[PDB]
Write an enzyme that holds these catalytic residues in place. Structure first.
Site, mmCIF file in Angstrom:
data_model
loop_
_atom_site.group_PDB
_atom_site.id
_atom_site.type_symbol
_atom_site.label_atom_id
_atom_site.label_comp_id
_atom_site.label_asym_id
_atom_site.label_seq_id
_atom_site.Cartn_x
_atom_site.Cartn_y
_atom_site.Cartn_z
ATOM 1 N N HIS A 61 0.686 -1.370 0.207
ATOM 2 C CA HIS A 61 -0.068 0.152 0.550
ATOM 3 C C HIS A 61 0.911 1.231 0.241
ATOM 4 O O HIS A 61 0.743 2.144 -0.592
ATOM 5 C CB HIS A 61 -1.004 -0.170 1.441
ATOM 6 C CG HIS A 61 -1.810 -1.476 1.189
ATOM 7 N ND1 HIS A 61 -1.906 -2.261 2.446
ATOM 8 C CD2 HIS A 61 -3.390 -2.007 0.706
ATOM 9 C CE1 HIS A 61 -2.574 -2.872 2.081
ATOM 10 N NE2 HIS A 61 -2.793 -2.766 1.395
ATOM 11 N N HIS A 91 5.964 7.471 6.494
ATOM 12 C CA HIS A 91 5.700 6.631 4.932
ATOM 13 C C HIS A 91 5.008 7.865 4.293
ATOM 14 O O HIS A 91 4.703 8.926 4.642
ATOM 15 C CB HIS A 91 4.527 6.248 5.346
ATOM 16 C CG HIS A 91 3.106 6.000 5.645
ATOM 17 N ND1 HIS A 91 2.789 5.810 7.209
ATOM 18 C CD2 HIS A 91 2.021 6.704 5.130
ATOM 19 C CE1 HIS A 91 1.382 6.255 7.195
ATOM 20 N NE2 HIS A 91 1.223 6.807 6.383
ATOM 21 N N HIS A 93 2.070 9.452 0.300
ATOM 22 C CA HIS A 93 1.508 8.773 -0.476
ATOM 23 C C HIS A 93 1.469 10.220 -1.518
ATOM 24 O O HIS A 93 1.728 11.170 -1.196
ATOM 25 C CB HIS A 93 0.139 8.896 0.001
ATOM 26 C CG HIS A 93 -0.394 8.864 1.362
ATOM 27 N ND1 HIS A 93 -1.620 7.369 1.966
ATOM 28 C CD2 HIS A 93 -0.277 8.824 2.591
ATOM 29 C CE1 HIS A 93 -1.520 6.967 2.546
ATOM 30 N NE2 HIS A 93 -1.119 8.059 3.675
ATOM 31 N N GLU A 103 -2.971 13.415 0.617
ATOM 32 C CA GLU A 103 -4.295 13.154 0.860
ATOM 33 C C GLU A 103 -5.524 14.883 1.415
ATOM 34 O O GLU A 103 -6.108 14.469 1.194
ATOM 35 C CB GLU A 103 -4.131 12.215 2.230
ATOM 36 C CG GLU A 103 -3.344 11.005 1.538
ATOM 37 C CD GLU A 103 -3.364 10.031 2.570
ATOM 38 O OE1 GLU A 103 -3.448 9.690 3.519
ATOM 39 O OE2 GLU A 103 -4.250 9.152 1.674
ATOM 40 N N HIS A 116 3.596 11.436 6.568
ATOM 41 C CA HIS A 116 3.016 10.662 7.689
ATOM 42 C C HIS A 116 4.441 10.075 8.100
ATOM 43 O O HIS A 116 4.884 9.356 8.206
ATOM 44 C CB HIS A 116 2.116 9.921 7.498
ATOM 45 C CG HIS A 116 0.668 10.747 6.461
ATOM 46 N ND1 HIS A 116 -0.231 9.651 5.741
ATOM 47 C CD2 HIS A 116 0.516 11.837 6.380
ATOM 48 C CE1 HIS A 116 -1.423 11.198 4.964
ATOM 49 N NE2 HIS A 116 -0.471 12.123 5.741
ATOM 50 N N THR A 195 -5.531 7.078 7.703
ATOM 51 C CA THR A 195 -6.443 7.314 6.489
ATOM 52 C C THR A 195 -6.124 6.242 5.268
ATOM 53 O O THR A 195 -6.700 6.048 4.068
ATOM 54 C CB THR A 195 -5.505 8.001 5.721
ATOM 55 O OG1 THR A 195 -4.062 8.541 5.009
ATOM 56 C CG2 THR A 195 -5.382 9.588 6.557
HETATM 57 ZN ZN LIG Z 1 -0.187 7.736 5.668
#
Ligand SMILES: [Zn+2]
Length: 257
Positions: A61, A91, A93, A103, A116, A195
């Protein structure tokens, strides 16, 4: 079997995780015209001098850079927080295109990516107990835009080939997360959630106002990661972001005028 694809993406998550339609879901849009300065806030205290990174893992992911959280080595305190929050992992996104990937959004603007740094409240003893509490986590969110390279990200970029596919990990010691921060610690804060599934409403979000810049080469290497496992059809790990969720009965507070 949640993900970010064509048939298992964020709009489907509610079927297995009904809190996806909850009261305190993240991310959100940050409207700079309605967020209000809160003089009761403090400065953040980011104490990462003793941080002990261990490993980097492609979880199918995103990838997590994991830290030793068995002592107060890398902690976040202050700001909106009471008590001490220990860094467990960070991590990102990111998008398939430079105009999406974050996000949170700011006045509906999407950034190329979002970092994050996840921390858990030491009063709850471990991560898994913390996520069961409304004040269990504190996530420091940092926007990425494409421009100049970020030197402190390069060590992450150069290990990505070693963790191309889901389930791969690599040693990742001696990484300094301070090299990922912008100059200013001015922030917005609000109560929300993880999230990704299980989407638990356990997060005090602290989203920095100032983005960091990464290079087009750096982002391109993120986009070579794979969602799939080794020996499976290649599916590029891109567009691993959840869109903004309704703010509902929440207020976003600013640490700055
Ligand atoms: Zn995250």
């Amino acid at each position: 079997h949640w993900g970010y694809g064509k048939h298992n993406g964020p709009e489907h998550w509610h079927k297995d995780f009904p809190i996806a339609k909850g009261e305190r879901q993240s991310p959100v849009d940050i409207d700079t015209h309605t967020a209000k300065y809160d003089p009761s806030l403090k400065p953040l205290s980011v104490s990462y001098d003793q941080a002990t990174s261990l490993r980097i893992l492609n979880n199918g992911h995103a990838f997590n850079v994991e830290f030793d959280d068995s002592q107060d080595k890398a902690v976040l305190k202050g700001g909106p927080l009471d008590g001490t929050y220990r860094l467990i992992q960070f991590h990102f996104h990111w998008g398939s295109l430079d105009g999406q990937g974050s996000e949170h959004t700011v006045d509906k603007k999407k950034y190329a990516a979002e970092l994050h740094l996840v921390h858990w409240n030491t009063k709850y003893g471990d991560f898994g107990k913390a996520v069961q509490q409304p004040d269990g986590l504190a996530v420091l969110g940092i926007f990425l835009k494409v421009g100049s390279a970020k030197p402190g990200l390069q060590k992450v970029v150069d290990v990505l080939d070693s963790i191309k596919t889901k389930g791969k990990s690599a040693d990742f010691t001696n990484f300094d997360p301070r090299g990922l921060l912008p100059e200013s610690l001015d922030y917005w804060t609000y109560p929300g959630s993880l999230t990704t599934p299980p989407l638990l409403e356990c997060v005090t979000w602290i989203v920095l106002k100032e983005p960091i810049s990464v290079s087009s080469e750096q982002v391109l290497k993120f986009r070579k990661l794979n969602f799939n496992g080794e020996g499976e059809p290649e599916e590029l790990m891109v567009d691993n972001w959840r869109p903004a969720q309704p703010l509902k009965n929440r207020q976003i507070k600013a640490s700055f005028k």
